[model samples]
Target: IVGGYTCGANTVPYQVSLNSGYHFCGGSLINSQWVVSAAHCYKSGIQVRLGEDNINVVEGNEQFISASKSIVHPSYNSNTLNNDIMLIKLKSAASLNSRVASISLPTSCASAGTQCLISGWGNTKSSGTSYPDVLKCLKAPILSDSSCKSAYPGQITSNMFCAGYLEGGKDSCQGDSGGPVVCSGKLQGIVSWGSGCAQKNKPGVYTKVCNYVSWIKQTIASN
Candidate 1:
């Protein structure tokens, strides 16, 4: 998702600091103490609050354990924004209050055409969310590999995969980065770099969770 240094009112705004205000990047709690988000969301520092319809909700309010620790992948390089995955471990397991259940990690692999859900605080237009204080969710399909190869032939590697709305209108824009792409009721990916949010030849790019399953287990186990 796009970060803000500057702004427009119509564009979505986020908390200046972790708890300072509100932001556009999307994040999901993976379990009671862990969260999945994009590497870019790690910019500056990140602290996300989930399980809420709006940023102001009191019932589901809980801050990320640290206003600052980030766990970005070692291979993440901003140039191509590859391996753009990260995990946020809360200092302690949080209470399973409303608006705060971890999205399930995929137990099964998804083939092409698997449909999924993406939720975010990103813009409804090019710059901001449709609702000022609330989040939005969308549906997209796991693009057929052949279609993806045909569209972005040289750009992909074995480590990457694709998804999007082919007919094209809805998509994650500037601020939709580091969000979850949930398919088959399981989290399968995290948004990576793509062709300007959503474009004709481009769908959103993401870190394939299936491809990185071993790494995920290694990381959690190590800690």
Candidate 2:
């Protein structure tokens, strides 16, 4: 996993709450009615936050939405990081809040290679447990799809995205499971996995958002 926060002109994040503590990660509101995130972090009814820095329950902080439902990619295997994306259906359509905006989904994110951004409150140093009460973000480049197959060897698949520098230095850590990977002002990937914190030759891998468009639509439509 990786750490730190990325500051930019355009970045929308979704947050999940665990226990009494909170971990922040990137998420984009696909629309007021639905939000997109990684699936490995899936739970039946997680507390979803939009446009929020941390998952704070304060009255006037980021908008918190109650998830009416959730769905994870059926193929995801957390042990192997095979399918690492998921979605949350809010009980009601969210109102626009300062830090919240639904990101536009691409018809095909496969072409958005080598240019993407990921954000989260994972470990800033690249390896360790997640931080408490702080949201960190970063901008990393998605490598050619070929890089993923080569890096992961037997584990990578077409449903995933490869990100980070070839030399390696930054990464997403423990709590950054399902987050956003933005490209060309649009969300193109979700934070999935990496070899380790900025490991050499191993970049972070994420779920290819484009591959799951139909899954998202189908899940949302049924919900």
Candidate 3:
């Protein structure tokens, strides 16, 4: 993400790295065994690694576990990136500690303009070829729907929201898919997709977590 900086070890306790034989995306640990991420991030051999800062070398506290079950939202749209969220159930529950914990989901919808946070090991710049080995974080205030629509046109959907700078600087970029967007200490969104990494007027689009509260609860409860 543009203008992002290295994160302190364990600063984002809920953050996890998604490794499908590769560190392709980031996710949030929502509970003892469940991780929330983007549907499009799913791939065979996907595993969850938590309590990690630099992914290149495993930290002593890192917990790597196989995914027992992965559930993609039934209505996920690959083409338009709508409803692009999913859950991955770990084979065993995570042993939470100071370095590993869960983040709360938003109790209600987040209004536009709320200053939020997006963190991951995503690329630092659009032209970068490799992702950051260490976890990085940046601030992205939620953009109004009208302004977001202006950038995306017909692509913006109700199931999604946008966040970033209108002037083009801070943003969530490649390798950040499925990362958490936290607002008011709650998980408000999930990095889904964007037009281009930190391009002018093109804020990052995310899966609006509040819109899927019912679905997430039902899915977790039923399983």
Candidate 4:
């Protein structure tokens, strides 16, 4: 994440790396067997790495499991990036511990100005391929829907929301898509899109998790 700090060990236990030989996207463990990520990250044969702090190091706490099935939101629109959420079922259930755990889903929507966290192994800089070995996190406040709409006029939708500074400097960059944005200890958003990596008045936009709770629950329950 741009302008963020390396996370402490196990600080984000629910965070998982979506890898296909290398880290391409980030996801959150919603349960022992299910992961929530961005629909755009979907591909066959994705490997989910749990309890990973540093991607280059061999951490014993890591659990590498393949995705058994993936379900993208039915109403997802690639052109506009609406409903940009996806669910992955693990080939096997993860063994939860201090180093690996699930994050709770939000029961209600987060209000504007609420301070939230965005964590991932995305690029540290806006312009190059300077991805970090360790996970990085940024504390940003949720911007109102109106403010978000103004920033990306005609692009922001009800399923999407913006977070971070209007003055720039902090954001979830490429390779961070599908990562979690936690507010009030619950999963509030999923990294979706942005104009750039932390540009002024172009805060990172995320898939509003609160709007998909029922769909997520029903999808998990049925499949």
Candidate number achieving the greatest lDDT relative to the actual structure: 4
Residue 77 accuracy (lDDT) in model 2: 80
User: In angstroms, how far off is 83's CA in candidate 4?
Assistant: 0.4
* lDDT tens digits, residue span 129-153, model 4: 6989999999999999999999999
lDDT of 3 by residue, 32-118 (tens): 999999999987668899999989886688999999898989988888888899999999999999899999988998999899989
Candidate 3 at 131: error in angstroms?
1.6
Q: Residue 32 error for model 3, in Å?
A: 0.5
Off by over 4 Å in 2: 1-21, 24-26, 54-59, 110-113, 127-132
Question: Which residue runs of candidate 3 sit more than 4 Å off their true CA positions?
Answer: none
Task: Give the CA lDDT, 0 to 100, for residue 134 in model 3.
Answer: 88
For model 2 the TM-score comes to 0.84
Maximum-TM-score candidate: 4
- Supply the TM-score for candidate 1: 0.80
Q: TM-scores for all candidates?
A: 0.80, 0.84, 0.97, 0.99
User: Which residue pairs collide, candidate 4?
Assistant: none
Question: Which 10 consecutive positions of candidate 3 have the poorest summed lDDT?
Answer: 123-132
lDDT by residue (tens digit), candidate 2, 18-129 = 2213443445578787777776676664566655554443535556667787777788787877667777777888776545566778776746345666776566665445
Rank list by lDDT = 4, 3, 2, 1
